[PDB]
């Protein structure tokens, strides 16, 4: 008898598992009730999503941040960059975009009923060719070979978030530290003016827009000096987008180290 | 065997034993060799362990060591992940530091429990003379006492302290104070005569440090240093193994339960961790987190705060503790061994009885005159009171009229001092009365006359006669009387009166009291004119055929509050044993008066006398009481001492040596008793050290007794023992409520890590937040259970069985951990998922989500809705998880502390709000909570988020469930005492 008799060893066990079943049962029911208060289309609260994050492809990380470095002379130092850039643009082929439709409105695309197939809302196409020179055609190297590389700037999507309708939200890239000897960062954006069209908003969530695709803007850096370390900051200029958070450097902004070796 | 035998040797043998001279002393040289052979004649001070090294082992021990290991890992992690430039994990620095602070702050809590830390031998060296007069080479001179050696020839005079243990060869009217040996300051005669077997009672040994009260003597130094009787008493005081108090035992018990369970939980999951694919360094960190979760970092601290609030309460009743452990022990005590003189008694000789008018009257002997008085309407009494008043030479010192007559300081012997205070208390003013009857002649008490006498003018102007008044030993006073005062008349002393006298006299003697006879005689003017010349050496006056007035007897009486205090303890299941250096007859009388011996109890010698049958045949079992003296005790085996302790529940040990007290204490301890000792004298310090708690009288106490004791009664009020028993029983019952409350929340601190590891959902509860709960939000409410009143009538309960009734036993733990702690854990997870799902993360998506969640290269993770999230945003939502789990536990700790108010009573019977400090603690809990949540800045400093009102409500159905569940459990056990429900689900 290992601390009590073996008949009492059993009636204790039964109680504890019964207790544990009831409690488990009670908990399971709480989660079920919870999943009925929950709307499958719109989150109850978006406390941590007041402003959208920003990200950039190709995303290569060094220590404590985004760090990108290649050699124009050795095409194999940028092979992977172009490759993940190409591989990323795959979901933006015209074929991958068959689920979403043309948007010409250049205004917010409000859908309150589900007219798209299988009881969904429509989403707007965005095809790789909208990035033009930085689409992989006719330059499959995305501007890396010529030392004027394209970086793709994507905005995190948030259900029902409206960025501001006085104009389209734009991207702007400049040097973090503008070199005293240097000129400003000279950049050409695709589409023109680095804008995301208004139609792509609001996002209605993965269940309402399963084929939704984030619009993109490519930043073709024309200025950047060879064999030097620089830092580029790309900010989203929109009425409802902020980029001042010191505890989230990816809020409304994205920064990266760059060095183009020769 | 260093026992003195030199009292039984002749001078021839003593000179040969010590190579000395009984008149010329040792040679100068040999005393210098002997000095180098034996060392100084001084008490060797054993230094206890250094103050700093006692603080060190306060940093070891079960929980302290786990904390050490945990901070070790946090430092290493903070090392490995800064040797590769990762700055985010400075938490693992702060984590290590905070833990190290907890280790150190806890270590202080165990060290500042010891208030005094004064040496015991400091007081013993203080009882030792600095100088002596020695004779060496027939030159008498004064030497340092530490230069004395066995063989030295020493001179003692009255007023100086005796410079070693000494075999007396010559003495002129020499008397000593042996209170440090016997506890009694009655002066003992020293002669060169061998008057006893034991060197402790023979007249021709005098002891180092004892005061020579009067006379002169010479003698041979027979022991020095630690070999003296006082050195051996001091050795026994300091060199006692420092055993753990009953509560220290109990605390280390539950620490060893927890440190084991922590190690189980940590190590089995470290294996699970590695088994499920984590790296070694990551499992090593889980082990640290699990230990931080499961171990109760603030528990030891709450315990010493609870003791402190008992110490404070005790202190307010003039009962002072020297270490907070001692604040419990009387609660667990089952045997009290008590000194008599100055402990149970006042150490003040007092008028106790009177024989007059052929009846024995009882005087009120209490120090506050709160007792029952005697009949004073008699005219025989008025006469006897005039005799004992005029025939006294003592006097009160000037201007003490604001002092109570018992406390006042009298110039005289103990006897006369007793009669004078008795006078002042029955009359208005004894010294003034005395002045109204001027003394015209006197014989002070003398060894030849064997009595004291004086003759007096009378106050009344009209009456010119002189009154002779005389006191002395009763038989010797009686043999000089021819008449006696009985009921208003004066009667010739026939054989029936002389026999009546002898009976009263031996009766008062049988009460352990000292007796004096008192007689008078009115001298006629016709033979003695108003100016008659009363010459002492002429003896013109008669001195025979006087009128006997009465007997007066005296005793060292109980303190007033002591007889009821002793009944209280017995009523509480505590055995009470008298252990005294005094003589047995007196000891038995006081034992009976105080209730150590109940009315009706008989010794085997008592029964033997009633049946007029010899003692050999009395059935030992049939005697409830027993009186054993020091000699009998020295004769017994230990199998015999335990057989006597078991046989007679009312036990008196008289005429015991200090070692004999300690031997009796430890005899009870070996039997399973938690033993307290109450005393006051140097002779009690060894027993005081050896007791599980030693209590000393603050006023009557000697320094050795106070410094050996663990508790001091500043007002000398023995009834404070009764308080101590109660508060001790309260603290223990309340500590287990507090501890139960503190432990139960360790489980929902733990289970989030178990799910985090084995399910890889995002981390529900961080280490920093845990510390805030363990060290801050929950600390006041656990402490407020100190103020919980008794559920039952505790002072009528038996003392607890220290083997079966522990502070924390398996029922308390399992219930707290694996039933209530589990309810809390379920609450927590319920809020966690509610807060996650309401923020975009459905439960099924959290499973396996940890890696992408905690990935700094992933700034666009998609939630259940497809929304994209940065690490930052995810991190804050992780904090929102911490915070929602934190309030799930706090809310449940409200229910918890309410169900810990009572272990058996319902909350509806004794009410929810009687304990007022608890509610203040509950309110302060919620405030510091709201502060942590809603003070701006908190998210970036302590990872606390201002949660939505809904996530405070989510766990309240669980708390209400905790109250209802325990409320019914406690109902079940009141309604079913013998049932399974009690035997298993009562804690
Ligand atoms: C000592 C022994 C202890 C034993 C402890 C046992 C703990 C486990 C207990 C129960 C297991 C989980 C119960 C889950 C119940 C689910 C009920 C349910 O039907 O809900 C539905 C969800 C799916 O939602 P949906 O796709 O329909 O939503 C779509 C939204 N709409 C509906 C609006 C369209 O089903 C689901 O989530 C399924 C996934 C459930 C999530 C897994 C959570 C894992 C966390 C466990 C922590 C437990 C801590 C226990 C502490 C014990 C202390 C000792
Ligand atoms: C022995 C008797 C004691 C126990 C009985 C008490 C339990 C039932 C009694 C009262 C329950 C409510 C008490 C008040 C506290 C509310 C807690 C709560 O509201 O909790 C609900 C959560 C999900 O919250 P929500 O999304 O509805 O919030 C909506 C927020 N708004 C409406 C503002 C948008 O789910 C859940 O706890 C699960 C709720 C399902 C009911 C099972 C309760 C399980 C308790 C055990
Ligand atoms: C005396 C002590 C007794 C010890 C008890 C041992 C009994 C249980 C032991 C094994 C049970 C089954 C083990 C399954 C076989 C190995 C599975 C495995 O090799 O998976 C390793 C995974 C990592 O692989 P990944 O694909 O996630 O890598 C992602 C790579 N990246 C991060 C770059 C994206 O580890 C992770 O980090 C996250 C885990 C994800 C994989 C699911 C496995 C969870 C299933 C069961 C665990 C429950 C055990 C609890 C036992 C409780 C006892 C009280
Ligand atoms: C002192 C007293 C304390 C007692 C507490 C002790 C706790 C010890 C308990 C251990 C039980 C561990 C259960 C382990 C479950 C592993 C589930 C699993 O590894 O299953 C795989 C799927 C999850 O989805 P996934 O792998 O595609 O996501 C991965 C997405 N990727 C591939 C892109 C990265 O699970 C599914 O479908 C549905 C499976 C639902 C799992 C619910 C588990 C709740 C159970 C217990 C709580
Ligand atoms: C038998 C006993 C068992 C039962 C036990 C019951 C326990 C009862 C305990 C009662 C506790 C009461 O708790 C009060 C909690 O107050 C929460 C306040 O909620 C505020 C909701 O607001 C949501 C916060 O949203 C974040 C953004 O806030 C925007 C507005 O901010 C205005 C300025 O405030 C700054 C901080 O929010
Ligand atoms: C719920 C399921 C998954 C777990 C069941 C495991 C069993 C074996 C565990 C869970 C709770 C455990 C009990 C918890 C409480 C007690 C009471 C204590 O005085 C002795 C140990 C004992 C009796 C434990 C024995 C083992 C135990 C019964
Ligand atoms: C104006 C415009 O956007 N035209 C093209 C067209 O080639 C195609 O028909 C349409 C989908 O119907 O996709 C796009
Ligand atoms: C800041 C800036 O240069 N904005 C230009 C704007 O001047 C021009 O009218 C427009 C043409 O579509 O392209 C954009
Ligand atoms: C739902 O509709 C979509 C339309 O894009 C179709 O591709 C898919 O096969 C349908 N699935 C079901 C289960 O009806
Ligand atoms: C984009 O492509 C067109 C066509 O070759 C060319 O004229 C233009 O200069 C290109 N822009 C850049 C920045 O290369
Ligand atoms: C912008 O949006 C608001 C919606 O509140 C709409 O009423 C307004 O007409 C819009 N204005 C422009 C210039 O797009
Ligand atoms: C780039 O590559 C060429 C040859 O492939 C090499 O000579 C040169 O040093 C490289 N650039 C740097 C900065 O190393
Ligand atoms: K803890
Ligand atoms: K005196
Ligand atoms: K007179
Ligand atoms: K004393
Ligand atoms: K002691
Ligand atoms: K002891
Ligand atoms: Mg005494």
Residue numbers in the entry:
A (entry chain B): 29 to 290
B (entry chain A): 47 to 1033
Cite, word for word, the article reporting this structure.
The highly acidic environment (pH 1) in the stomach is generated by the gastric proton pump, H+,K+-ATPase, which mediates an exchange of H+ and K+ across the parietal cell membrane that is coupled with ATP hydrolysis. The H+,K+-ATPase consists of two subunits. The α-subunit is composed of 10 transmembrane (TM) helices, in which the cation-binding sites are located, and three cytoplasmic domains (the nucleotide (N), phosphorylation (P) and actuator (A) domains) that catalyze ATP hydrolysis and the auto-phosphorylation reaction. The β-subunit is a single-span membrane protein with a short N-terminal cytoplasmic tail and a large C-terminal ectodomain, and it is involved in correct membrane integration and targeting of the complex to the cell surface.
